[PDB]
């Protein structure tokens with residue numbers, strides 16, 4: 001009975017939290033970041049790929065060797081899915097617009113994932129489409145549907161919320177999280193409000209695609225959040241407030257996380273942290289504790305705008 | 320600042336990023352070990368805050384120097400010649416504790432690696448590709464000599480590198496295997512890991528075997544010549560001072576292609592995204608676990624770094640053509 005994992009799946013979750021220090025200068029509340037970046041595959045999606053597979057196995061809808069998993073996604077979910085599929089011997093089909101750059105695709109294939117590329121013009125909607133086409137025809141096919149699947153917010157209610165609740169020893173006052181599939185905010189929010197109805201739950205979205213605030217969907221750079229429609233997995237009743245953060249301000253905060261905290265994080269962690277730092281300057285919050293989710297490591301985004309300013313100075317660096 | 324329930328009684332929240340270092344999990348190998356007579360449990364340094372075993376020695380070499388008062392933040396300038404993970408581990412520590420950090424490396428170095436280093440605010444000085452590491456080491460010696468409060472870490476010589484392994488990596492594996500690790504397998508670059516863990520583990524139990532790993536193409540510990548290879552992170556081409564050649568019972572030499580192939584299967588069979596040296600170490604581990612002697616015994620092997628860092632190396636170039 002050794003303290004070793006049987007398999008990669010048992011490594012998921014139980015991520016740690018870290019206080020923000022110098023970047024939190026000025027703030028009257030403490031901020032502790034929940035580092036989903038330290039998931040076996042460096043994002044929060046490692047929890048839902050595990051849980052939507054397992055939830056299904058348990059309900060008896062899927063078995064390894066037989067069922068074929070199918071999901072329209074390239075992002076972090078495809079990755080969370082790919083490594084779970086590798087390790088468990090489920091065949092996996094992931095659809096995405098051809099647009100997808102080599103980087104995520106190389107990594108997805110290295111996991112044995114079959115890639116089906118759809119039409120770049122058609123974006124996500126074209127990908128859901130091929131995937132409904134592939135589900136609708138393929139013998140043993142099974143779709144996860146990350147925006148509708150109750151097991152997405154369920155895993156967060158079962159692990160992520162209790163982790164934050166345990167690590168802060170019930171002291172958490174405010175929980176801040178960006179909304180993509182809505183699963184984090186909903187499962188954590190639900191869990192924490194049942195422990196303590198007084199806690200505040202605060203969502204974050206792009207200023208360029210603020211549909212929960214009211215606005216309409218528009219282009220934005222915050223990879224991971226503002227999917228452009230209200231996802232079924234979002235319980236909007238759970239939130240106390242939504243804060244809109246700009247792309248520029250997400251990217252700037254992400255860079256300061258690296259430069260000041262030594263935390264290498266993605267643009268969405270930057271947006272969540274920008275909002276938490278704002279919330280931590282409100283006088284009514286002196287002394288309180290804010291927990292904020294950083295959904296993914298930043299090394300994954302070397303080719304995106306997060307690192308562009310840095311890329312420009314590196315390209316001209318003389319030998 | 321704002322007061323925090325700190326110390327032994329307070330919250331389970333790291334005070335800063337340094338406190339996230341170490342305590343990494345182990346995972347048994349399953350279908351990739353089909354056919355082995357021994358159990359294999361991998362030590363996953365790929366799950367360090369910045370994805371490599373080197374996060375442990377960025378921390379300990381810097382902390383060792385503060386503790387002895389050789390350096391202090393906002394005044395000392397850290398300087399290291401480093402083409403691999405050591406610059407990353409120094410970079411995030413330097414950022415979080417407020418040191419200026421200059422890293423030297425040949426201008427061969429991929430651009431993504433530079434980008435990352437510079438996101439942490441490290442300063443980069445590029446050296447002459449023809450001169451390799453030796454040329455970078457030379458330029459780091461010059462900067463040290465010419466910079467008023469410069470301090471060089473010297474990852475190959477600094478005894479804080481193996482010492483952090485004696486104090487953390489070794490103990491963890493011993494706690495985690497509840498003292499049942501029969502054999503320990505590790506790639507050698509600086510020798511730190513093999514030295515600290517082997518030392519710690521021999522001390523607890525001298526019966527435990529310790530096996531080190533090098534490239535077939537640069538197999539100097541087996542009596543061969545130094546040359547060029549691809550198992551990045553090991554086979555530095557000389558025997559470094561941080562290697563206590565005394566605690567090793569054996570050296571297995573594994574090839575680029577088998578290292579590469581083994582990393583590929585770890586991805587495909589285990590769901591484990593690892594660098595090429597994790598493949599070399601794993602391959603070595605696998606053979607050992609197939610020696611009849613070792614039936615029913617427990618092997619621990621180190622996986623030094625996460626694979627995603629290497630999307631541009633030979634590891635992924637066959638997968639890169641497919642796309």
Ligand SMILES: *Cc1c(COP(=O)(O)O)cnc(C)c1O
Pocket residue numbers: 043044045075076077178179180181182183184185223224225266268269295296
């Ligand atoms: C999924 C994701 C989010 C949002 O998390 P949800 O629980 O889906 O709302 C934010 N950032 C990144 C990088 C993500 O992958």
Ligand SMILES: *Cc1c(COP(=O)(O)O)cnc(C)c1O
Pocket residue numbers: 371372373403404405506507508509510511512513551552553594596597623624
């Ligand atoms: C550091 C390094 C090694 C070797 O470990 P040492 O303790 O230096 O002997 C192996 N692989 C990689 C990727 C490394 O960065």
